[PDB]
CSV table of C-alpha atoms and ligand atoms in Angstrom, one decimal:
chain,number,residue,atom,x,y,z
A,1,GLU,CA,15.5,8.4,20.8
A,2,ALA,CA,12.3,6.4,22.0
A,3,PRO,CA,12.7,2.6,22.8
A,4,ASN,CA,10.8,0.4,20.4
A,5,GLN,CA,8.7,-1.7,22.8
A,6,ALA,CA,6.9,-3.6,20.0
A,7,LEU,CA,6.2,-7.3,20.6
A,8,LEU,CA,7.5,-9.9,18.1
A,9,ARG,CA,5.2,-12.8,18.2
A,10,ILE,CA,6.7,-16.2,17.5
A,11,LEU,CA,4.0,-18.6,16.2
A,12,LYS,CA,4.1,-22.5,16.1
A,13,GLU,CA,3.9,-24.1,12.6
A,14,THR,CA,1.0,-26.3,14.0
A,15,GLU,CA,-1.0,-23.2,14.8
A,16,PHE,CA,-1.7,-22.3,11.2
A,17,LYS,CA,-2.7,-24.0,7.9
A,18,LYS,CA,-1.6,-23.1,4.3
A,19,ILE,CA,-4.7,-23.4,2.1
A,20,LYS,CA,-3.2,-22.4,-1.4
A,21,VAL,CA,-0.5,-20.3,-3.1
A,22,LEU,CA,-1.4,-16.6,-3.9
A,23,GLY,CA,1.8,-15.8,-6.0
A,24,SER,CA,5.4,-16.7,-6.4
A,25,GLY,CA,8.5,-14.6,-7.3
A,26,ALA,CA,12.3,-14.3,-6.7
A,27,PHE,CA,11.9,-13.6,-2.9
A,28,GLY,CA,10.0,-17.0,-2.4
A,29,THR,CA,6.2,-17.6,-2.2
A,30,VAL,CA,3.2,-16.0,-0.5
A,31,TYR,CA,0.4,-18.4,0.6
A,32,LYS,CA,-3.2,-17.9,1.5
A,33,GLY,CA,-3.8,-19.5,5.0
A,34,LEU,CA,-5.7,-19.7,8.3
A,35,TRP,CA,-4.2,-19.1,11.8
A,36,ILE,CA,-6.0,-21.0,14.6
A,37,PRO,CA,-4.4,-19.8,18.0
A,38,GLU,CA,-4.1,-22.1,21.1
A,39,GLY,CA,-7.6,-22.8,22.5
A,40,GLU,CA,-9.1,-19.4,21.4
A,41,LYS,CA,-11.9,-20.7,19.1
A,42,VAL,CA,-10.8,-18.2,16.3
A,43,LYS,CA,-9.7,-18.7,12.6
A,44,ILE,CA,-7.7,-15.6,11.4
A,45,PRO,CA,-7.5,-15.4,7.5
A,46,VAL,CA,-3.7,-14.8,6.9
A,47,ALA,CA,-1.0,-14.3,4.2
A,48,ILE,CA,2.1,-16.4,4.8
A,49,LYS,CA,5.3,-15.0,3.1
A,50,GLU,CA,8.0,-17.8,3.2
A,51,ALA,CA,16.8,-21.8,-0.4
A,52,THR,CA,18.1,-20.9,3.1
A,53,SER,CA,21.0,-18.4,2.8
A,54,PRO,CA,22.1,-16.3,5.9
A,55,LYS,CA,21.8,-13.1,3.8
A,56,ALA,CA,18.2,-13.6,2.7
A,57,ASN,CA,17.1,-14.3,6.4
A,58,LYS,CA,18.7,-10.9,7.5
A,59,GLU,CA,16.6,-9.2,4.9
A,60,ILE,CA,13.3,-10.9,5.8
A,61,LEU,CA,14.1,-10.4,9.6
A,62,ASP,CA,14.7,-6.6,8.8
A,63,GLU,CA,11.2,-6.4,7.1
A,64,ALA,CA,9.7,-8.3,10.2
A,65,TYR,CA,11.3,-5.6,12.5
A,66,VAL,CA,9.7,-2.7,10.6
A,67,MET,CA,6.3,-4.5,10.1
A,68,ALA,CA,6.0,-5.4,13.8
A,69,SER,CA,6.8,-1.8,14.7
A,70,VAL,CA,3.6,-0.3,13.0
A,71,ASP,CA,0.0,0.0,14.1
A,72,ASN,CA,-2.4,2.1,11.9
A,73,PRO,CA,-5.7,1.3,10.1
A,74,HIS,CA,-4.0,2.2,6.8
A,75,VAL,CA,-0.7,0.2,7.2
A,76,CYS,CA,-0.1,-3.6,7.2
A,77,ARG,CA,1.1,-4.9,10.6
A,78,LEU,CA,3.1,-8.2,11.1
A,79,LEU,CA,0.9,-10.7,13.0
A,80,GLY,CA,4.0,-12.9,13.8
A,81,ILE,CA,6.9,-15.0,12.5
A,82,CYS,CA,7.3,-18.7,12.4
A,83,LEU,CA,10.8,-20.0,13.0
A,84,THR,CA,11.0,-23.1,10.7
A,85,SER,CA,14.0,-24.0,8.5
A,86,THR,CA,12.6,-21.6,5.9
A,87,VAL,CA,11.4,-18.8,8.3
A,88,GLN,CA,8.0,-17.2,7.4
A,89,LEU,CA,6.2,-13.9,8.0
A,90,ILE,CA,2.5,-14.2,9.0
A,91,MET,CA,0.5,-11.2,7.7
A,92,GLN,CA,-3.2,-10.2,7.4
A,93,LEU,CA,-5.0,-11.6,4.3
A,94,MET,CA,-5.9,-8.7,2.0
A,95,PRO,CA,-8.5,-10.6,0.0
A,96,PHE,CA,-8.7,-8.3,-3.0
A,97,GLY,CA,-4.8,-8.3,-3.7
A,98,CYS,CA,-2.9,-5.1,-4.8
A,99,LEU,CA,-4.6,-1.9,-5.8
A,100,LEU,CA,-2.7,-1.7,-9.0
A,101,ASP,CA,-4.3,-5.0,-10.4
A,102,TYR,CA,-7.6,-4.1,-8.7
A,103,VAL,CA,-7.9,-0.8,-10.7
A,104,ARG,CA,-6.9,-2.6,-13.9
A,105,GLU,CA,-9.4,-5.5,-13.3
A,106,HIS,CA,-12.3,-3.2,-12.1
A,107,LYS,CA,-12.1,0.1,-14.2
A,108,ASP,CA,-15.8,-0.2,-15.3
A,109,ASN,CA,-17.0,-0.1,-11.7
A,110,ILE,CA,-14.5,2.3,-10.1
A,111,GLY,CA,-16.0,5.7,-9.4
A,112,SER,CA,-14.7,9.1,-8.1
A,113,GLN,CA,-15.7,8.4,-4.5
A,114,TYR,CA,-13.6,5.2,-4.4
A,115,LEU,CA,-10.5,6.9,-6.1
A,116,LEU,CA,-10.5,10.0,-3.8
A,117,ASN,CA,-11.2,7.8,-0.7
A,118,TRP,CA,-8.2,5.6,-1.6
A,119,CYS,CA,-6.0,8.8,-1.9
A,120,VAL,CA,-7.1,10.0,1.6
A,121,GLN,CA,-6.3,6.5,3.0
A,122,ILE,CA,-2.9,6.3,1.4
A,123,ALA,CA,-2.1,9.9,2.7
A,124,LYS,CA,-3.2,8.8,6.3
A,125,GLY,CA,-1.0,5.7,6.2
A,126,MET,CA,1.9,7.7,4.9
A,127,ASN,CA,1.4,10.5,7.4
A,128,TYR,CA,1.4,7.7,10.1
A,129,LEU,CA,4.8,6.4,8.8
A,130,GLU,CA,6.1,10.1,9.0
A,131,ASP,CA,4.9,10.2,12.6
A,132,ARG,CA,6.8,7.0,13.4
A,133,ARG,CA,9.8,8.7,11.6
A,134,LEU,CA,9.7,5.9,8.9
A,135,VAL,CA,10.7,6.5,5.3
A,136,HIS,CA,9.0,3.8,3.1
A,137,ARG,CA,11.4,4.1,0.0
A,138,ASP,CA,9.0,2.0,-2.2
A,139,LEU,CA,5.5,3.5,-2.3
A,140,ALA,CA,3.5,2.5,-5.5
A,141,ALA,CA,0.0,1.1,-6.3
A,142,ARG,CA,1.5,-2.4,-6.3
A,143,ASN,CA,2.4,-1.9,-2.5
A,144,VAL,CA,-1.1,-0.8,-1.5
A,145,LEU,CA,-3.3,-3.8,-0.7
A,146,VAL,CA,-7.1,-4.1,-0.7
A,147,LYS,CA,-8.8,-5.5,2.5
A,148,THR,CA,-12.2,-4.5,1.0
A,149,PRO,CA,-12.9,-2.1,-2.0
A,150,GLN,CA,-13.6,0.6,0.7
A,151,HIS,CA,-10.5,-0.1,2.8
A,152,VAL,CA,-6.8,-0.1,1.5
A,153,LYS,CA,-3.5,-0.4,3.4
A,154,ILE,CA,0.2,0.4,2.6
A,155,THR,CA,2.6,-2.6,2.7
A,156,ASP,CA,6.1,-3.9,1.7
A,157,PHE,CA,8.7,-2.6,4.2
A,158,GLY,CA,11.6,-4.4,2.4
A,159,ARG,CA,13.2,-0.9,1.7
A,160,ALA,CA,11.8,1.1,4.7
A,161,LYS,CA,14.3,3.1,6.9
A,162,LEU,CA,14.5,5.8,9.6
A,163,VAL,CA,15.7,0.4,-7.4
A,164,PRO,CA,12.2,1.8,-8.5
A,165,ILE,CA,13.3,4.6,-10.8
A,166,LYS,CA,9.9,5.6,-12.3
A,167,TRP,CA,8.4,6.2,-8.7
A,168,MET,CA,11.5,8.1,-7.3
A,169,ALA,CA,12.1,11.7,-6.4
A,170,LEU,CA,15.0,13.3,-8.4
A,171,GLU,CA,17.2,13.8,-5.3
A,172,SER,CA,16.8,10.0,-4.8
A,173,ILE,CA,17.9,9.1,-8.4
A,174,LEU,CA,20.8,11.6,-8.4
A,175,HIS,CA,22.0,11.5,-4.8
A,176,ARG,CA,20.3,8.5,-3.1
A,177,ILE,CA,18.6,11.1,-0.7
A,178,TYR,CA,15.3,9.7,0.9
A,179,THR,CA,13.1,12.0,3.0
A,180,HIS,CA,9.4,11.9,3.9
A,181,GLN,CA,9.1,14.5,1.0
A,182,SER,CA,10.7,11.9,-1.4
A,183,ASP,CA,7.8,9.5,-0.3
A,184,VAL,CA,5.5,12.4,-1.4
A,185,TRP,CA,6.9,12.2,-5.0
A,186,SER,CA,6.1,8.4,-5.0
A,187,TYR,CA,2.6,9.4,-3.6
A,188,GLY,CA,2.1,11.6,-6.6
A,189,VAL,CA,3.0,8.7,-9.0
A,190,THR,CA,0.7,6.3,-7.0
A,191,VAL,CA,-2.2,8.7,-7.5
A,192,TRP,CA,-1.3,8.9,-11.2
A,193,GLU,CA,-1.4,5.1,-11.3
A,194,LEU,CA,-5.0,5.1,-9.8
A,195,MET,CA,-6.3,8.0,-11.9
A,196,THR,CA,-5.2,6.2,-15.1
A,197,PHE,CA,-6.7,2.9,-14.0
A,198,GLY,CA,-3.3,1.2,-13.6
A,199,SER,CA,-1.1,2.7,-16.4
A,200,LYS,CA,2.7,2.1,-16.4
A,201,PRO,CA,4.4,5.5,-15.7
A,202,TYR,CA,6.6,6.6,-18.6
A,203,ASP,CA,5.7,3.5,-20.6
A,204,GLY,CA,8.3,2.6,-23.3
A,205,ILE,CA,11.0,5.0,-21.8
A,206,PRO,CA,14.1,3.2,-20.3
A,207,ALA,CA,14.8,4.0,-16.6
A,208,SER,CA,18.2,5.7,-17.5
A,209,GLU,CA,16.4,8.4,-19.6
A,210,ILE,CA,14.0,9.2,-16.6
A,211,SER,CA,16.7,11.3,-14.7
A,212,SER,CA,17.3,13.6,-17.8
A,213,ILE,CA,13.5,13.7,-18.6
A,214,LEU,CA,12.7,15.0,-15.0
A,215,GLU,CA,15.7,17.4,-15.1
A,216,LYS,CA,14.2,19.0,-18.4
A,217,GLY,CA,10.9,19.8,-16.6
A,218,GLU,CA,8.8,16.9,-18.0
A,219,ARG,CA,6.3,15.1,-15.7
A,220,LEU,CA,3.5,12.4,-16.0
A,221,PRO,CA,0.6,13.6,-18.2
A,222,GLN,CA,-2.9,14.8,-17.0
A,223,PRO,CA,-5.1,11.6,-16.9
A,224,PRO,CA,-8.4,12.2,-18.8
A,225,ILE,CA,-10.6,11.8,-15.6
A,226,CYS,CA,-8.6,14.5,-13.7
A,227,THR,CA,-9.7,18.0,-13.4
A,228,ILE,CA,-6.9,20.7,-13.1
A,229,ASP,CA,-7.6,20.6,-9.2
A,230,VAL,CA,-6.5,16.9,-8.9
A,231,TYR,CA,-3.7,17.2,-11.4
A,232,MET,CA,-2.3,20.3,-9.7
A,233,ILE,CA,-1.9,18.2,-6.6
A,234,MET,CA,0.0,15.5,-8.6
A,235,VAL,CA,2.3,18.2,-10.1
A,236,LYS,CA,3.1,19.8,-6.6
A,237,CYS,CA,4.4,16.3,-5.4
A,238,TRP,CA,6.8,16.5,-8.4
A,239,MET,CA,8.6,19.8,-7.6
A,240,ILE,CA,12.5,19.8,-7.6
A,241,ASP,CA,12.4,21.6,-4.2
A,242,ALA,CA,11.3,18.8,-1.7
A,243,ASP,CA,10.1,21.4,0.8
A,244,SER,CA,7.8,22.9,-1.9
A,245,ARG,CA,6.0,19.6,-2.2
A,246,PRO,CA,2.9,19.1,0.0
A,247,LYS,CA,3.1,17.4,3.4
A,248,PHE,CA,0.9,14.2,3.9
A,249,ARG,CA,-1.2,16.0,6.5
A,250,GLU,CA,-2.1,18.6,3.7
A,251,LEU,CA,-2.8,15.7,1.2
A,252,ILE,CA,-5.3,14.1,3.7
A,253,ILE,CA,-7.1,17.6,4.0
A,254,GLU,CA,-7.0,18.3,0.2
A,255,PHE,CA,-8.4,14.8,-0.9
A,256,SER,CA,-11.0,14.8,2.0
A,257,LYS,CA,-12.5,18.1,0.8
A,258,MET,CA,-12.6,16.6,-2.7
A,259,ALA,CA,-14.1,13.3,-1.5
A,260,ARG,CA,-17.1,15.3,-0.2
A,261,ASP,CA,-18.1,16.2,-3.8
A,262,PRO,CA,-16.3,13.6,-5.9
A,263,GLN,CA,-18.0,14.5,-9.3
A,264,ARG,CA,-16.6,18.0,-9.1
A,265,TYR,CA,-13.0,16.7,-9.1
A,266,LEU,CA,-13.1,13.5,-11.2
A,267,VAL,CA,-15.1,13.1,-14.4
A,268,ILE,CA,-16.0,9.4,-15.0
A,269,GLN,CA,-18.7,8.3,-17.5
A,270,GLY,CA,-21.2,6.1,-15.6
A,271,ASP,CA,-20.1,7.4,-12.1
A,272,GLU,CA,-22.6,6.8,-9.2
A,273,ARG,CA,-24.3,4.0,-11.1
A,274,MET,CA,-21.2,1.9,-10.6
A,275,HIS,CA,-20.8,-0.6,-7.6
A,276,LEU,CA,-18.1,-2.8,-6.0
A,277,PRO,CA,-18.4,-5.6,-3.4
A,278,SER,CA,-19.3,-4.5,0.2
A,279,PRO,CA,-19.7,-6.3,3.6
A,280,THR,CA,-23.5,-5.7,3.0
A,281,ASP,CA,-23.4,-8.1,-0.1
A,282,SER,CA,-24.8,-11.7,-0.4
A,283,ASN,CA,-21.8,-14.0,0.2
A,284,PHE,CA,-19.1,-11.3,0.4
A,285,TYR,CA,-17.0,-13.1,3.0
A,286,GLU,CA,-14.4,-24.5,4.7
A,287,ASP,CA,-15.8,-23.6,8.2
A,288,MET,CA,-16.7,-19.9,8.1
A,289,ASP,CA,-18.0,-20.4,11.7
A,290,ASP,CA,-15.3,-18.8,13.9
A,291,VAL,CA,-13.4,-16.6,11.4
A,292,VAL,CA,-12.5,-13.1,12.8
A,293,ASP,CA,-10.4,-10.7,10.7
A,294,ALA,CA,-6.9,-9.8,12.1
A,295,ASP,CA,-8.1,-6.2,12.8
A,296,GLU,CA,-10.6,-7.5,15.5
A,297,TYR,CA,-8.1,-10.1,16.9
A,298,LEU,CA,-6.2,-8.4,19.6
A,299,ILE,CA,-4.0,-9.8,22.5
B,301,3QW,C1,6.9,-10.3,-1.4
B,301,3QW,O1,6.5,-9.1,-0.8
B,301,3QW,C2,5.3,-9.3,0.1
B,301,3QW,C3,5.4,-8.1,1.1
B,301,3QW,C4,4.2,-8.2,2.0
B,301,3QW,N1,2.9,-8.2,1.3
B,301,3QW,C5,1.8,-8.3,2.2
B,301,3QW,N2,1.8,-7.6,3.3
B,301,3QW,C6,0.7,-7.6,4.1
B,301,3QW,C7,-0.3,-8.4,3.8
B,301,3QW,C8,-0.3,-9.2,2.7
B,301,3QW,N3,-1.4,-10.0,2.4
B,301,3QW,C9,-1.9,-10.4,1.1
B,301,3QW,C10,-1.1,-10.4,-0.1
B,301,3QW,C11,-1.7,-10.8,-1.3
B,301,3QW,C12,-3.0,-11.3,-1.3
B,301,3QW,C13,-3.7,-11.3,-0.1
B,301,3QW,N4,-3.1,-10.8,1.1
B,301,3QW,C14,-3.3,-11.7,-2.6
B,301,3QW,C15,-2.2,-11.4,-3.4
B,301,3QW,C16,-2.1,-11.8,-4.8
B,301,3QW,C17,-3.2,-12.1,-5.6
B,301,3QW,N5,-2.7,-12.4,-6.9
B,301,3QW,N6,-1.3,-12.4,-6.8
B,301,3QW,C18,-1.0,-12.0,-5.6
B,301,3QW,N7,-1.2,-10.9,-2.6
B,301,3QW,C19,0.2,-10.5,-3.0
B,301,3QW,C20,0.5,-9.0,-2.8
B,301,3QW,C21,1.3,-11.5,-2.5
B,301,3QW,N8,0.8,-9.1,1.9
B,301,3QW,C22,2.8,-9.2,0.2
B,301,3QW,C23,4.0,-9.2,-0.7
């Protein structure tokens, strides 16, 4: 098939500054930082993902490969890699963190317009991955990052090709089959995570029971804010027949029609009177002088 002519940018350690730590786990640690290229007079807000074991490097270099091979407004691109002893991925700073925590922390100000717009954006990013013949294998609200409350992007290409049980299609749990239609099942679950304001799917149920639960005909419940219109979409993503499930191009269309009249499809008390931070807010955005967002920094 088509040659992957993507450019892998190697960045010097001296070209960027680590400001603070954002979060640490088993993988390593993600830092908040600034990238100041050559003599460009720009400061790009960045996220730097950083023991050295040859196996862990192959995994991070596999994620770098996939992340450098994407370009879409609703997908996180790799800005570059820094080849130190540790080896670190330089990514775009998504100031508002993951969507999962965002919905939990801001339920009182999240309205129908935002929720439906987020669904359209995830469908667009996912449909792009399908175009690039990329199967995510780990879509969830934790892997959708917030640039601004009005702009979200899909991330975490650590599992992407060409285990998270409660987000998986039945063919995936039973046979390890992953298609773009299995990403649709995970898309259904992600929507459920948003519509419930960050609830844990199948809370209290052990992952081993999930396979048998789905086989019986049981699915995630109808969230209180969901009309039968929105829930019907969730249910269709959870059909046994993968070809029966909607295609992402149909999900973009479905959620877009709904996003034109949000109150008809989602019932939230206090809707329209709610508000989230916007680039039209007082002090929404050290030396703020020459900072440009990665999306406007092109070479
Ligand atoms: C370990 O897996 C990594 C895979 C890549 N992913 C990513 N991808 C693209 C951009 C990006 N930037 C990015 C990631 C961020 C934040 C800002 N910008 C803030 C947080 C955070 C806040 N409180 N706790 C954490 N995080 C998390 C997800 C590490 N982060 C971050 C997680």
